[PDB]
JSON list of C-alpha atoms in Angstrom, two decimals:
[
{"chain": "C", "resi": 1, "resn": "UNK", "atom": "CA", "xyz": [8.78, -15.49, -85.42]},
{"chain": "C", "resi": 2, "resn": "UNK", "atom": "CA", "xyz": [10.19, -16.60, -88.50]},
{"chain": "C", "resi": 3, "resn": "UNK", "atom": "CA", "xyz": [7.29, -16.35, -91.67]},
{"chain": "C", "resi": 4, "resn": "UNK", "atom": "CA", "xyz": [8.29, -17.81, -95.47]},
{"chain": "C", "resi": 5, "resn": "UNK", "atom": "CA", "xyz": [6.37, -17.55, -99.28]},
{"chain": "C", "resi": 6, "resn": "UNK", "atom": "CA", "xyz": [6.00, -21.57, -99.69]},
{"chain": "C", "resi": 7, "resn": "UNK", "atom": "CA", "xyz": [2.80, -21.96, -99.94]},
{"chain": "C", "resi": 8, "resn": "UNK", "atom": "CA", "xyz": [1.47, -25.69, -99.45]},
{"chain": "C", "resi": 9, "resn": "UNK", "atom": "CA", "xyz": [-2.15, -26.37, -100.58]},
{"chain": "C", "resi": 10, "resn": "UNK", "atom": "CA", "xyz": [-3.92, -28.95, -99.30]},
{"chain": "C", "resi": 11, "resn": "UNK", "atom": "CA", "xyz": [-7.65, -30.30, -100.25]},
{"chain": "C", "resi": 12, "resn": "UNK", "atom": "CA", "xyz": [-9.42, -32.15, -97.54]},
{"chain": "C", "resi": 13, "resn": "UNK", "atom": "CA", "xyz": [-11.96, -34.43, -98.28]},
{"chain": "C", "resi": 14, "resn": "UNK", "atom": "CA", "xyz": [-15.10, -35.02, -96.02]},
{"chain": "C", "resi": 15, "resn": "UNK", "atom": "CA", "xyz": [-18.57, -36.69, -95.58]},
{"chain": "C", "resi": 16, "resn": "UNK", "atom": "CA", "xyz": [-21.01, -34.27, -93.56]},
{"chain": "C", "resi": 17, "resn": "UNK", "atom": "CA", "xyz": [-22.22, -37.45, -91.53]},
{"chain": "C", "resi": 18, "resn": "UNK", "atom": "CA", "xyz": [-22.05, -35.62, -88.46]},
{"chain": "C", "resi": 19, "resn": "UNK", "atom": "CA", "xyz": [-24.31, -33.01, -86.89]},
{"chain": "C", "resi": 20, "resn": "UNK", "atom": "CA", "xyz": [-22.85, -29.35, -87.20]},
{"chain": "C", "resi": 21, "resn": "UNK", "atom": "CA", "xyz": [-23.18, -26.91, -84.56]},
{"chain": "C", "resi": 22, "resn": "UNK", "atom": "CA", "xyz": [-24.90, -23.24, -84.73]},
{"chain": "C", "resi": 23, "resn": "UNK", "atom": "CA", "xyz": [-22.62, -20.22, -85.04]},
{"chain": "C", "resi": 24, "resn": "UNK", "atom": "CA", "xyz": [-24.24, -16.83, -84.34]},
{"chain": "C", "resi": 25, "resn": "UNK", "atom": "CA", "xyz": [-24.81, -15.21, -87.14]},
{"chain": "C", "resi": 26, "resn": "UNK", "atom": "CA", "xyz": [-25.95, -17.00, -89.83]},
{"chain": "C", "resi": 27, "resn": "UNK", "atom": "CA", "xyz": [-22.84, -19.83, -89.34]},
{"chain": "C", "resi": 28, "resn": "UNK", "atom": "CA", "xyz": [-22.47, -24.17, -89.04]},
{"chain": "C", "resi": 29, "resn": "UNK", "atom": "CA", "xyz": [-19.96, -25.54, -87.87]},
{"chain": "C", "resi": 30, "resn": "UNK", "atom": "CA", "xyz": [-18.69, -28.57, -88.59]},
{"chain": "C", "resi": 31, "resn": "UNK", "atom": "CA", "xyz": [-15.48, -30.82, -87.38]},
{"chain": "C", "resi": 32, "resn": "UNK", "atom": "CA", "xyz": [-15.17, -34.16, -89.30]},
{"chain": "C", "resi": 33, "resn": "UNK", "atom": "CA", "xyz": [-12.47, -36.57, -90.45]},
{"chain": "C", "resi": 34, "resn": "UNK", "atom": "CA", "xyz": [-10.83, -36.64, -93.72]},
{"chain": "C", "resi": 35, "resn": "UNK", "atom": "CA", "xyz": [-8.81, -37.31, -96.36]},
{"chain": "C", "resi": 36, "resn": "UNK", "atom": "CA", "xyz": [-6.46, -35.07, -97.95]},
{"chain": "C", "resi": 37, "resn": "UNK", "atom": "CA", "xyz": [-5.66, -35.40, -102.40]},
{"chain": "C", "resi": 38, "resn": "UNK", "atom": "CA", "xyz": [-2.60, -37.78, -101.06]},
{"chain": "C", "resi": 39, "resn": "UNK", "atom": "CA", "xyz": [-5.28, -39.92, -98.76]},
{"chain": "C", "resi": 40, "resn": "UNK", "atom": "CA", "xyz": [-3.72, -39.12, -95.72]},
{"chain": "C", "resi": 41, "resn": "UNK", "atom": "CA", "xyz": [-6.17, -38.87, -92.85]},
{"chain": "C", "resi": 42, "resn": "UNK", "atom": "CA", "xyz": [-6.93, -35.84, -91.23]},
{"chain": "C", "resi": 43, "resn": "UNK", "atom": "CA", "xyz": [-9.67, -33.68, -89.02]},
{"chain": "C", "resi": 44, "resn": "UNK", "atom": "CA", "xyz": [-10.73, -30.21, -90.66]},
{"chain": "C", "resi": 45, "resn": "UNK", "atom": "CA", "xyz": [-13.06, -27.52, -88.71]},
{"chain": "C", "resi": 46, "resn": "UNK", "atom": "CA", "xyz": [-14.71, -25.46, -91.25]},
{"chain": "C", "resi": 47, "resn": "UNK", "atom": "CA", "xyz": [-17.93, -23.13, -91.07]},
{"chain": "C", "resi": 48, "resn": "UNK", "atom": "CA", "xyz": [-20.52, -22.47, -94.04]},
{"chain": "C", "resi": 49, "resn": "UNK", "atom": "CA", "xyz": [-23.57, -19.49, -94.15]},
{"chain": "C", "resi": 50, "resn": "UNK", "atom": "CA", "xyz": [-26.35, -22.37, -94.41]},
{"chain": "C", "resi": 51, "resn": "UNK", "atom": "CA", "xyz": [-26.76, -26.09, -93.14]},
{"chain": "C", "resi": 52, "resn": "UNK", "atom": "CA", "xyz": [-25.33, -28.32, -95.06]},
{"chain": "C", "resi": 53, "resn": "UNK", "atom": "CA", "xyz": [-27.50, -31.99, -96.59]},
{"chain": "C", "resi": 54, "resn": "UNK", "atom": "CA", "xyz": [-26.80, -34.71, -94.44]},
{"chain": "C", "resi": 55, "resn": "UNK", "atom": "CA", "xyz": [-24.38, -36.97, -96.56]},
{"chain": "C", "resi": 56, "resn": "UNK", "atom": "CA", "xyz": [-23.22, -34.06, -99.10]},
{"chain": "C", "resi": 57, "resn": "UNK", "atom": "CA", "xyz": [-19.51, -34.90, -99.57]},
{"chain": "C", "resi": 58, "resn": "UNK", "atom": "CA", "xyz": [-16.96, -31.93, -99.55]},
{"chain": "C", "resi": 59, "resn": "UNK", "atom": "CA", "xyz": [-13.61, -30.35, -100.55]},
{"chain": "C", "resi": 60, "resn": "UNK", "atom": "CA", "xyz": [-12.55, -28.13, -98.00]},
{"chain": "C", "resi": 61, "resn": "UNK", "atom": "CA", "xyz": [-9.26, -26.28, -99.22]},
{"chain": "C", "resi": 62, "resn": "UNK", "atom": "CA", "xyz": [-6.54, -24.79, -96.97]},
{"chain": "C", "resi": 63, "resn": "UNK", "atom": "CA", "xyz": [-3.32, -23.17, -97.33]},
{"chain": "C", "resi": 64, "resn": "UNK", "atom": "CA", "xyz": [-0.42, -24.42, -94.34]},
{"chain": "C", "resi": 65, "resn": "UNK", "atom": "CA", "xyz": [-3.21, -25.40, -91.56]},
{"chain": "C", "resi": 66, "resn": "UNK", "atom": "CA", "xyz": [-5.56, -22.37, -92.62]},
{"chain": "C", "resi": 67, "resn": "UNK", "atom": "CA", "xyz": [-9.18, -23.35, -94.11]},
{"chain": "C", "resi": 68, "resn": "UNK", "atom": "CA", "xyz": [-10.16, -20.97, -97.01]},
{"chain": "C", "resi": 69, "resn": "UNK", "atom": "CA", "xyz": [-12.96, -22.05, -98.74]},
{"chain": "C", "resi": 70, "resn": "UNK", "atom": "CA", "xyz": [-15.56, -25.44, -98.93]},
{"chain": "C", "resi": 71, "resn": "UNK", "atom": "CA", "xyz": [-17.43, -26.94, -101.86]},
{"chain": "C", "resi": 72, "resn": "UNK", "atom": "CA", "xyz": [-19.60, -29.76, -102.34]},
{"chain": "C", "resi": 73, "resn": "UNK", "atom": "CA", "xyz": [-18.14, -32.20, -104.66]},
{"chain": "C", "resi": 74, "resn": "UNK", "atom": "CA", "xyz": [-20.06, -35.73, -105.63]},
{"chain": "C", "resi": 75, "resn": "UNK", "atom": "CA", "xyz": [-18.62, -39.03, -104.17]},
{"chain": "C", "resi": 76, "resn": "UNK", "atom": "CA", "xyz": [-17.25, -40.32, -107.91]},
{"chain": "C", "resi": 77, "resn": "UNK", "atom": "CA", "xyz": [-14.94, -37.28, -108.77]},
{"chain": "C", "resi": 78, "resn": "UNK", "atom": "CA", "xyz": [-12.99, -37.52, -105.36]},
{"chain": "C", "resi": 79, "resn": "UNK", "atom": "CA", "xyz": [-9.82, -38.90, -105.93]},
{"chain": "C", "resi": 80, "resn": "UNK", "atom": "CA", "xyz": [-9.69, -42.67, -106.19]},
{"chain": "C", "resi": 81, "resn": "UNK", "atom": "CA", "xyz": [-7.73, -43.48, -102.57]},
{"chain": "C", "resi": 82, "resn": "UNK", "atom": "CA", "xyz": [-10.14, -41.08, -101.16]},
{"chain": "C", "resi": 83, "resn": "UNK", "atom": "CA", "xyz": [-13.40, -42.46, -102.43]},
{"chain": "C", "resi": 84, "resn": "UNK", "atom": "CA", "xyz": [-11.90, -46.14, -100.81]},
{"chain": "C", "resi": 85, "resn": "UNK", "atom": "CA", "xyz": [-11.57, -44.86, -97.46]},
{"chain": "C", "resi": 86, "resn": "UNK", "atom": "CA", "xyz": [-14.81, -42.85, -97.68]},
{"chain": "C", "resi": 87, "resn": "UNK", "atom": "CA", "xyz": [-16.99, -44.88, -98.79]},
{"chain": "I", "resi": 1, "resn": "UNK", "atom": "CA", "xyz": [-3.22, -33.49, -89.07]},
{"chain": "I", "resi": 2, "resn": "UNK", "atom": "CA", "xyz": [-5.89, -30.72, -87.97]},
{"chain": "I", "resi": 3, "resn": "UNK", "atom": "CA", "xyz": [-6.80, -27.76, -90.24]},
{"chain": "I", "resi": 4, "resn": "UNK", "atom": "CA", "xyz": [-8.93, -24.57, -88.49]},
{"chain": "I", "resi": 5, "resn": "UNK", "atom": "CA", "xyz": [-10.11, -21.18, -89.72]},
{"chain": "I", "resi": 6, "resn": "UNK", "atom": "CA", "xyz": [-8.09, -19.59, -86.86]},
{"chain": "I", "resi": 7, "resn": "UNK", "atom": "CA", "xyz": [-5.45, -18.53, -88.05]},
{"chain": "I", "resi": 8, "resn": "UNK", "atom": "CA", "xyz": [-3.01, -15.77, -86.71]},
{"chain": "I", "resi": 9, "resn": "UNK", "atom": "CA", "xyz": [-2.77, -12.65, -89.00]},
{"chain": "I", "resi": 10, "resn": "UNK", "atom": "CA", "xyz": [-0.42, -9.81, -88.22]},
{"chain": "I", "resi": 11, "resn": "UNK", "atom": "CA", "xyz": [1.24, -6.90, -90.27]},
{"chain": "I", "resi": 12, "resn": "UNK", "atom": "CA", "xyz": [5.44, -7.21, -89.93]},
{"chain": "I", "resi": 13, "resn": "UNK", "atom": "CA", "xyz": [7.32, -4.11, -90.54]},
{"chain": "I", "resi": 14, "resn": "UNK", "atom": "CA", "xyz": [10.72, -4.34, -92.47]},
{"chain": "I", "resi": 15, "resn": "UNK", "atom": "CA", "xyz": [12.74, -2.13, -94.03]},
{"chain": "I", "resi": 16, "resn": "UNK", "atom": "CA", "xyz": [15.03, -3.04, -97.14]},
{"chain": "I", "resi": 17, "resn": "UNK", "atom": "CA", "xyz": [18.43, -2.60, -95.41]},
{"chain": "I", "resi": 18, "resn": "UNK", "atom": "CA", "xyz": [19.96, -5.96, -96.31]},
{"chain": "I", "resi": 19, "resn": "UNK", "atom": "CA", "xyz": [20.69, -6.41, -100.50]},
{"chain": "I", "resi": 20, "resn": "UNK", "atom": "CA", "xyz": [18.28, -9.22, -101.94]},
{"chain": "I", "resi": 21, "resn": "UNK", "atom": "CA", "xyz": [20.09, -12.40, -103.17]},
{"chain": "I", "resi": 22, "resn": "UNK", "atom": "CA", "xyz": [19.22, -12.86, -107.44]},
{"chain": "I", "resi": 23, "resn": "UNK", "atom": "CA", "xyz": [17.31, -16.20, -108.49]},
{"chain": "I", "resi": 24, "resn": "UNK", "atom": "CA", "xyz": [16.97, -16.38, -111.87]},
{"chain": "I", "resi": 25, "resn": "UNK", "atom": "CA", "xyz": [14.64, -15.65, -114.40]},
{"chain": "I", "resi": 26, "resn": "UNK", "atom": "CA", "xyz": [14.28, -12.05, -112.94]},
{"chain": "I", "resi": 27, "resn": "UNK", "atom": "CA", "xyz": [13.92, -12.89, -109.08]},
{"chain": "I", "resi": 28, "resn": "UNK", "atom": "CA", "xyz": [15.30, -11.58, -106.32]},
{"chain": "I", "resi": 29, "resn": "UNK", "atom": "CA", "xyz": [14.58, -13.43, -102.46]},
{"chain": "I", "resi": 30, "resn": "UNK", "atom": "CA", "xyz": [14.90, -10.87, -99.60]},
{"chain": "I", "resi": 31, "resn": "UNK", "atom": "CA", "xyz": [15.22, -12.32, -95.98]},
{"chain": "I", "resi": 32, "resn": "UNK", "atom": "CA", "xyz": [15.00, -9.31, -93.68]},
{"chain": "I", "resi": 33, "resn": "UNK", "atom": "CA", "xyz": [14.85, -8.85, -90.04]},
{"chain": "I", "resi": 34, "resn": "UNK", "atom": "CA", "xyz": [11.56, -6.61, -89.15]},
{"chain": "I", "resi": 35, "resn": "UNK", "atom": "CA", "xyz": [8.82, -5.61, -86.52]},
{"chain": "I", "resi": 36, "resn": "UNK", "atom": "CA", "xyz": [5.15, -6.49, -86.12]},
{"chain": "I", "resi": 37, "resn": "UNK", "atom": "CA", "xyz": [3.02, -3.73, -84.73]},
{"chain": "I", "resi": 38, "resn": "UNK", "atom": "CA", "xyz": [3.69, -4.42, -80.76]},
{"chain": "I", "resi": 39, "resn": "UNK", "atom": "CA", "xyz": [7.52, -4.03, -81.45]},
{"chain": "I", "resi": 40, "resn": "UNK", "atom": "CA", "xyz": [8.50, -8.49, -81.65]},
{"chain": "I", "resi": 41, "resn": "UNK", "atom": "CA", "xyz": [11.18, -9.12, -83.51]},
{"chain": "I", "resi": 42, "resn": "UNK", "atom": "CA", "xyz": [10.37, -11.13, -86.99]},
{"chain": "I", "resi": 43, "resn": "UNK", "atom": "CA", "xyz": [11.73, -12.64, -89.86]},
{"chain": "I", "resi": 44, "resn": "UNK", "atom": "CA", "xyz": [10.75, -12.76, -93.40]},
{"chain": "I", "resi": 45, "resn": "UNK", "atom": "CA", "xyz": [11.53, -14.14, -96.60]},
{"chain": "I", "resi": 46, "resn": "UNK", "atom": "CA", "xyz": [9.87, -13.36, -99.57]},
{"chain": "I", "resi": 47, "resn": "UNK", "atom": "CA", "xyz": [10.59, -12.64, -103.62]},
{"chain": "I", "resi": 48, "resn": "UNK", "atom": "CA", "xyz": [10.11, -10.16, -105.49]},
{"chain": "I", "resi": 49, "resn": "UNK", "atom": "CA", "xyz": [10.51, -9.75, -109.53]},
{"chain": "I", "resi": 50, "resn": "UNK", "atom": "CA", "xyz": [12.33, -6.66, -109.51]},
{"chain": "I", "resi": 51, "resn": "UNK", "atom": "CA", "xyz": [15.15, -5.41, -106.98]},
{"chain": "I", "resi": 52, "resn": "UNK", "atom": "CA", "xyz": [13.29, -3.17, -104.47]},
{"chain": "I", "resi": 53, "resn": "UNK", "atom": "CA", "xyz": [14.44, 0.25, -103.57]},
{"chain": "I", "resi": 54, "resn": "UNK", "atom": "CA", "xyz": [16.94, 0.51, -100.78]},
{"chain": "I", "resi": 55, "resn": "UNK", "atom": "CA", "xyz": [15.66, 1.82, -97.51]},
{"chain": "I", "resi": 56, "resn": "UNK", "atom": "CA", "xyz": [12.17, 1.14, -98.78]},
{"chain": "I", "resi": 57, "resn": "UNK", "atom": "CA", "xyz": [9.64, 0.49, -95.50]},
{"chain": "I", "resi": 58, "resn": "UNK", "atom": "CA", "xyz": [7.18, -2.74, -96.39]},
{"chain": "I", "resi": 59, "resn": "UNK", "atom": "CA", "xyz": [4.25, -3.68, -94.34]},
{"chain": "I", "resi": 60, "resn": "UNK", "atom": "CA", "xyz": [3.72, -7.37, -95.28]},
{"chain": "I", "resi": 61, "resn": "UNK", "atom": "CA", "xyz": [1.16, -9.30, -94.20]},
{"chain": "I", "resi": 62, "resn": "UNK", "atom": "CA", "xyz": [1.72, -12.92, -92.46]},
{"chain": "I", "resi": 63, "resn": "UNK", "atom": "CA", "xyz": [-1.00, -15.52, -92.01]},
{"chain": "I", "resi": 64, "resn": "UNK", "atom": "CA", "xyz": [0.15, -18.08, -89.67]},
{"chain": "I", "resi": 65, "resn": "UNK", "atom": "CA", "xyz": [3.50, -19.00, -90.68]},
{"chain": "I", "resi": 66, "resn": "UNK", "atom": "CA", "xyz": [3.71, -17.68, -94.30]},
{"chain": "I", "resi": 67, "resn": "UNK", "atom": "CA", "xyz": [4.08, -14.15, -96.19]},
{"chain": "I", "resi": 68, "resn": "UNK", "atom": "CA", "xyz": [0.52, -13.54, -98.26]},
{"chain": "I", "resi": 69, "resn": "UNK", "atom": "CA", "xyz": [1.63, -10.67, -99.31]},
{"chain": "I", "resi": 70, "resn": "UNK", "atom": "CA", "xyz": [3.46, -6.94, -99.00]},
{"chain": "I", "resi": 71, "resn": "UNK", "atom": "CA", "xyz": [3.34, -3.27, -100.33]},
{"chain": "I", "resi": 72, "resn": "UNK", "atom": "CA", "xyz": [5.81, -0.14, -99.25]},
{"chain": "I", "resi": 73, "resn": "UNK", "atom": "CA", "xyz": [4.38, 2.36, -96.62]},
{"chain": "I", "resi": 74, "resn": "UNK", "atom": "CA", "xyz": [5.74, 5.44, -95.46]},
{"chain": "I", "resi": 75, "resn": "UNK", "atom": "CA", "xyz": [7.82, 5.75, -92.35]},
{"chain": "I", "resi": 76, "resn": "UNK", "atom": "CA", "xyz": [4.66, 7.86, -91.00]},
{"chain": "I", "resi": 77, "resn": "UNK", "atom": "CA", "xyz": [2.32, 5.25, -91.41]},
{"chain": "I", "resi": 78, "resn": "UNK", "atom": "CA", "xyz": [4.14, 2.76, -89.09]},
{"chain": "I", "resi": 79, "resn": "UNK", "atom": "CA", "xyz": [2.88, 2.15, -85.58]},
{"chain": "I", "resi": 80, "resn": "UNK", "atom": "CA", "xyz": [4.98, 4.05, -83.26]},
{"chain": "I", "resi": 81, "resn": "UNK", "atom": "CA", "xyz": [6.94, 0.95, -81.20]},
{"chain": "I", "resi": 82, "resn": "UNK", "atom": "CA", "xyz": [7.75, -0.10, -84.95]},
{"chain": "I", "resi": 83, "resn": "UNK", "atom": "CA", "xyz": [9.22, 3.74, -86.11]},
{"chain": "I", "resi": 84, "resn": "UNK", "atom": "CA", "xyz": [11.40, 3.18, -83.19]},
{"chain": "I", "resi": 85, "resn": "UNK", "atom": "CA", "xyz": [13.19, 0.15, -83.89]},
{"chain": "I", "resi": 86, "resn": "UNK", "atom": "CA", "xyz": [13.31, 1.03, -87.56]},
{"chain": "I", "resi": 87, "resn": "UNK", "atom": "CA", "xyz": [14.28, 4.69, -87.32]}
]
């Protein structure tokens, strides 16, 4: 294998407006459509310690195709090509 | 595209046996030909901010496709199928 330091970030953008699925212990899943900071549509599986509100929008950020961390974010400070193709 | 938290982490063996190439201010990028723990053949680039010691053994760590990060080890604390390609 062949492994290099440039390090892409990417910020995916999502609407939990489907139902997650139990993980054992203490985990939700959750697969959903998205946007990433460009608007360029993508599909991000991502698990959080609790259940997340039904319509809480969220930043899930990755590095190459790897998830790292989510956060909830509110619908107005998502970037603007984002908030478009959300709403 | 899809994003997952599954993402393949293994340690990669090298030794510093080939001269780093300079980038300036105060860089130096290695690309060295190493081991992972089950004896594969790898590459890896990297940079560093000061010209490592020659003959040096890292362990550096690879997530998926990229370098996250490196420190030197001893020869003894290599798996054995890597202390034999490296010896």
């Amino acid at each position: 294998g062949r492994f290099n330091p440039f390090i892409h970030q990417q910020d995916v953008y999502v609407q939990i407006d489907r139902d997650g699925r139990h993980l054992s212990p203490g985990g939700t899943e959750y697969t959903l459509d998205g946007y990433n900071a460009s608007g360029k549509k993508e599909e991000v599986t991502f698990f959080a310690g609790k259940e997340l509100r039904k319509n809480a929008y969220l930043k899930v950020k990755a590095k190459g195709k790897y998830v790292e961390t989510w956060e909830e974010v509110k619908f107005e400070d998502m970037p603007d090509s984002v908030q478009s193709k959300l709403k």
